[PDB]
Amino acid sequence: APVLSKDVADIESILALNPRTQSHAALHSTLAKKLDKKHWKRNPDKNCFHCEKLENNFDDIKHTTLGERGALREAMRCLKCADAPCQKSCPTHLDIKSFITSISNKNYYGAAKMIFSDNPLGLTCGMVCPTSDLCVGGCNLYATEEGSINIGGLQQFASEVFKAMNIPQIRNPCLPSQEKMPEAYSAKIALLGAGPASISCASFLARLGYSDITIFEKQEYVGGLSTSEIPQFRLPYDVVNFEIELMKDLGVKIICGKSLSENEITLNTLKEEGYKAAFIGIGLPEPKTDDIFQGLTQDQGFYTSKDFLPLVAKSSKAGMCACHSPLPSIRGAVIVLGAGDTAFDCATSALRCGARRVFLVFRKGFVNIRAVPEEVELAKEEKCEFLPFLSPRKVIVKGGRIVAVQFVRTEQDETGKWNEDEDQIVHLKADVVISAFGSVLRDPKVKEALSPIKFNRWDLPEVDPETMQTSEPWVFAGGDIVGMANTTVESVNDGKQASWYIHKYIQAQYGASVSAKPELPLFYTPVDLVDISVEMAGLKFINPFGLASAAPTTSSSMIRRAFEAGWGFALTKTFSLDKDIVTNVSPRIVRGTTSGPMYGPGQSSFLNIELISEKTAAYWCQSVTELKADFPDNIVIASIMCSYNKNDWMELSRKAEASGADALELNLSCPHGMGERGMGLACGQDPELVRNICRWVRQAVQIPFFAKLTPNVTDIVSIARAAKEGGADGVTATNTVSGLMGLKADGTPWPAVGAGKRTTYGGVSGTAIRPIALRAVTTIARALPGFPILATGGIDSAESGLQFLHSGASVLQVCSAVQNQDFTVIQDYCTGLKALLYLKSIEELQGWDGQSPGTESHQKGKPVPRIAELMGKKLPNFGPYLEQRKKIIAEEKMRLKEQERKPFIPKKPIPAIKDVIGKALQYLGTFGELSNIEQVVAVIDEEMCINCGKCYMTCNDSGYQAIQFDPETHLPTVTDTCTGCTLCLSVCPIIDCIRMVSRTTPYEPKRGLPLA
Amino acid sequence: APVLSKDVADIESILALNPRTQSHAALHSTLAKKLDKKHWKRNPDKNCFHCEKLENNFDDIKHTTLGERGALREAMRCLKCADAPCQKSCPTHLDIKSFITSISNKNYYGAAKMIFSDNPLGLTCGMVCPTSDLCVGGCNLYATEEGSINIGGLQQFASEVFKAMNIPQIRNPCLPSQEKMPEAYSAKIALLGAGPASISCASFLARLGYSDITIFEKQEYVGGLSTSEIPQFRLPYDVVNFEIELMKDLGVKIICGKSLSENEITLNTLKEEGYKAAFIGIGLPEPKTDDIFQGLTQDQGFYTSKDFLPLVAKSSKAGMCACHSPLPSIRGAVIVLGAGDTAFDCATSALRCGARRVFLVFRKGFVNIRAVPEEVELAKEEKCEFLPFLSPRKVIVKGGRIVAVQFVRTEQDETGKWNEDEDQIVHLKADVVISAFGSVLRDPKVKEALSPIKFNRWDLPEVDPETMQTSEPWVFAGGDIVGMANTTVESVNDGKQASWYIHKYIQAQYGASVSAKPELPLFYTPVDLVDISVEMAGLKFINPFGLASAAPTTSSSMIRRAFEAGWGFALTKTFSLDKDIVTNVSPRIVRGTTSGPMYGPGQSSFLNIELISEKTAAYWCQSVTELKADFPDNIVIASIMCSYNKNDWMELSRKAEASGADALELNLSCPHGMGERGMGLACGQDPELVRNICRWVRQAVQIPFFAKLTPNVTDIVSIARAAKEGGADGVTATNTVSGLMGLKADGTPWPAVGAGKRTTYGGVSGTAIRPIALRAVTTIARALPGFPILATGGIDSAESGLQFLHSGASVLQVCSAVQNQDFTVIQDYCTGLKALLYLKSIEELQGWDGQSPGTESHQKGKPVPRIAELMGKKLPNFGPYLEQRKKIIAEEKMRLKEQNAAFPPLERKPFIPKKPIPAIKDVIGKALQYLGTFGELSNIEQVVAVIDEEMCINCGKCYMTCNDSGYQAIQFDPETHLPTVTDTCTGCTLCLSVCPIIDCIRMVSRTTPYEPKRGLPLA
């Protein structure tokens, strides 16, 4: 027989690139290396002076954009800090900790809800906020080598997913009905300008219940600068439209073609028409001009940022204007005057118009550029040239068009004063000139319409910085027009701030007062109306999430705070009779080593050698009475433990019952410590003992009680059944897994107690034991149908919680997830579960896995271009191949240059918790019930691949050597020797890059040698 | 009574900053926000035009420097790619995949060994390589939002730890003894210039066995440009000294004060003195000059990069020159001409000398700067000004001092040609001028000493690009002198490339030939001599690592490659008699969800519903015969399974024994599939059945055999004991844990088989089950002392392997770690175990935890300054506090400058084992002494948490865990965000467990009387 233990020529060939440790140092001349380097190049070449062509290319260029894979990693990395400095550094005070936590838990709805609650333009800001100067600038992770969290990108991702869900906004469900609202709320309100500031202000007013809000916009388009000037390649117009419609869901009206101006709309005309309040958010409508450009027109090649950017926007933003205008024909050398952030958008936009070269010329130095670094970077990588210390003086015109610009050198002296030497003239060539000197409010017709409000020295309407109120009580202003805000988020905040005092003003005009403490409503949608209550063993839970008997329930004061946060129920730490009082050792709770040396947020497990509660039964019983008195709707379950003694169990259970506990939990599963005292596992591993203890309790009390089972047994069903036979109303599955978390290199354990550095087997908790808990819950559910199960073991999100519900559990206990964070996670779990149930009724989102959209082919989270000349060309994203892709993409843009949002409606009833419990059991069975004829094979999407070769290595040393890994393109190809083991898909770093599909060829197992 | 379920005022107060979900939108005016922002500011202010004072500040400014915490995260993130593009993009071809894998496995020694094997200046390069234009430029992770891997920083970290280990280099232990080396190896070899190129060349020649190698260096210092010009704030001189000493460990000699010149050393004098070969690595010793600077001196304020940088270096690098060197007094405006990478080091160095302002003036545009971006950024963040399109023409001097420089405008025409308008003159003020136009070789006395080698039109010695050989057969050249290399790493490669052909040349001169395939030796140290063999049940294992019976052993051809890679032993996939032939389903192996939505490298677990081998017993038995025939020293264990039938077990075991297997493994633990056919989990949970099966096998065969136990039982010791009573020679602990990995939101499972999307309980493997496996191994070891244990369950490194050895196991089976990577991990496991055993004999490194140094107070991996005026000042690293810290640090630098206290020497000495290196047999079971009952633990030796404020990153996680999961014992300052553990601490240890900074929080003995809180008094 051939040499069986040896690879034939063909396999040896397929394994050519499989890693093998070298026995000697490598030998490759410096010349050979220089010639080989360019083939694998991924990033920009520092020696390349050009860059691809960007004409008519408006694809997203943001470095912060994230796909799901990337967002999940970055969200998990976030420390989710207390009193977070990032939130303090956010103009709209977004609870960054909460929304990022929701993202890491895959609860995109909850994340978006939190974002929009404080920022009505959440998506826009996620995309355009100059974070390095705001939230990200204060991020604690800046103190790590990996750096600060990409907050903007994460905000953008959650908001994008929400937008894709097509869920509308609704008024707070707690507000009185429309007709029951006081008369004051029907007061006519007017807002001028449809920009971030007015959109924000009108949104909050609408949240408060005002039913007659109207925004008067001068232009035919809405959104202000977010629409008219911010480039499409930074902020898609589609985003603006999304946020505008969300506002309209609250009844806000918008009327375009209406301007604030003398003989148009004025404060007087509004007052005479009955309007009770007005908000001014018209921004700075005019370009800051300069003498030297007088008479210059566009025909000659001159523009101000106010002239240029809107032209590019109208041409590149579909939906902005009814008319499809041409892209400004910019050819030759372009000069952008100024170093502000607007100048850089002019420079980058110029390139899209066909500019051959773009020069940014400013009167100060490089160090004086005050534009956000991230913005400056975009212009720099697109090869814009920078010319410092030059002040414009003349725009030389010859032939009816600009041919150059004359400058004069500038310089700083000692005192730090700037001088411009008039003798040193500079001649710069240029076919087009764009001034980006800023914007202002000059139009006398407009200023006049604001009479008689007071203006300050800046020639801008004066307002109280806290109330946003002008000299005229009923008139407020905010945004660019006030001159303080420098960003979209600050403008949104101005409108937000104003909304509260406009509310206060209006209510007072009707003789009504408002709360002393500001109460702007949060953001709501129909998802928030979803009922997640559940009944079990005769008990009613407002939600299925509760605190397990553990460290988070060390004290009853903590349970009170958990209930105040919103937890449906809670277990007391396990307590006992005075004679069984315990004393803990220290250290006793350590982090898991189950997922490597990863510290901080999201520990994959914990190990503890803690005993039951150190507090007395008297303390616990009095505490339960207090808790039930103050929180009658929150379920309190008393966890108790006794040795194998009938009188003790009856005494303690009755004492607990008399205190008012809704139910009891019998701790028959402590994996350490209590066992030596004749309790815990010893009693919980023997069906007979479990049965008798339950009988003793059943006979002692009338309230329901549940037996908490240990997973450390051969057959957990036998003890679950014993509990049922004994009279238990259900079982809690499960307690911690017995284990040893590890040793230091010197052999000592952790935890290590005392000078002797001793330890004992502890209990493992967390996500690392979830597979064990899920198996336990499902086996019990299948064996004892209908028998109440309280799940516990690795529940850290609505998503994982739903898994246990589907597995047969009715309620969900949590410990480790709280130890990893805090009690506020309940907000995430509830909004998350509501969203998951809501989405099950949306027919158009059935291709989604929970809150996750179906993964689309992408690279760096950005969708891959669907150009015919690119598909199936084996062009990886590196080296000469990358160069070809760019050439094809640019070509496509030139070719293209040559050529309604509706909410989804539930088409079926939203399921209730009772409708989903146990629905997964139908898929579970024996191995024999699985089909061995319906085989699958792996198929790789070459467009999503990042060429790492992990699929290849896993199949080579852990599989069937079925993958070909190209030595030039580093692209893998699954051949037909694939057996569908699925390991390659399991190790792939790109989510859904590899998928398992039905095998079309006949499957035949490899026997190595024929059978007889 | 008081309301027990309520927090008293004091606690409510301590909980002030504890997170609580808001019921309404927040309200904070834009003005209020603007005023609050600066208090929490971490990064540079885009509105601030001046960077803190840097006079005499030579602290590390590299953004790529990593501490252990950061290195482990970045190493774990690396994809560890096949045929890695980063390696292809590295001039020395470092096996980046391997060394980063070693780092993620905490095997810093193995990482360093791999690095130095291909690059003798591994640490230097890690710190200075312009990676964006090299290795990192080709990193696949560039295609992800998080970006490319910080390869240089990881290389630097591993190399730094190795440096701290103070382990010397030794010649390959396989080379013949010195006296038995052929005469050819005693040939006198000479190298000119002690720079990267010569150091590399001499190192490899020494590795090959040459015993008479001498480097002649012109200056009194060694290291070349790494020493004389690269700033101390980018490359500490002691890094250079470290690498020089490693080279000297191989006998290489260095003689300073000897120059290659017409007056001293020439090719002719060397030839007449008997030298058989020479390597020229003198670089480009002279500055590129320009007529307009004729006559200008330092006194007036003029310097070339060649004049300036060496002065700053001699003054800031302790150990470079023994004499005292005054820091160049540079005050006023400084002009650096040029935009090359040297210009930027001149600019940043000028600031350290006292420059008030530094301007970089270049004749082309910003887009034309060809210096690596990372270098440009350093100058930019330190506020250096940039002036483009300006070409120097005249230097104005008054009072014997420079006062200005005259330039002329430049620009490109439509043809791409550069022009300089002579009419547009520019007057720029300046007190100091530094030209950084490059370097060259012009000295006729030096060029003459190279006669008669041929020079090319670049006026540089001509060499064959592949052999590095000049027109004179015995003379080779490399590095800057050749004009191709632009980096330290390329210069190192030039010397590396030349060493092989110099070797070939010399051998040929003695009538000997060399292998057709280049065989430059790897890097070796005494650690490599450590014996990691072990004996168990009469079997001899060359190393304790082996492949578990699993996917990695699906085919015997895979086992062959694993043995070729170096694995000590391997198990065949479990096989059975023909009548019990199985057929797998698909999908059947999925990634674990045990550590969240983290994909790619290092999955924390896998779940499988795979059955035993689909290949026949005939295939397996023939395969074992073949494997044992070709690898007699590698242990092969045949895994077999039968239903509860005596004849079957005896038939199969005998068939396996006859094939030549060293031993057998009885699979009595498959947690799924086989149970239905009456095997695996069925028979392995009952002590009686286990005992009988072992008895049947014991009487059927004579070779040793082990029972593979399942962890899915109440008492694993009962099964293990049953196996021992049945005659088993040992047990394998353990097989996979029974579980369900999860469901999709629609309720369907994964894996899901068929259109019905069905599944069944599978087996969990990987690090997620290690706690269960460790417990199993320790409990069996304590109950049955001396009984052989083969460990399996989450072993993915030498470190984790050592934990199982310490727990009682003799050998280590691996599966998931290979599924997560490949067979080469064996190299990491072996070097790692050798290092861990070696370190146990080094007395001066007892404060280390294995290969991990004790954690020093740091921020971003950089040691915190020990200035008195900073300690205990509650100055966090943000906002106005950060401003204060910088002010204090700058003052300290000025204070240290006034001292002119000639820097202390530098004597590097190797640590010597002061006790025998333990063998595997000496560590087995050594951890059992610390294990016991809960009652054996002391409840009087309590501890409390103590936080090092200097390492804290102010996240408040310790605060939040103690609040909602602890005892509300931590105060979190609302202004500094600094936590303080109070006396109410109970030492639960949760805060330390969730802290993101390794060792920021430590548990220390409680000094106050500990008293449990009862809530209510006892009666």
Ligand code: SF4
């Ligand atoms: S050891 Fe425990 S009681 Fe002490 S400050 Fe840390 S979480 Fe709180």
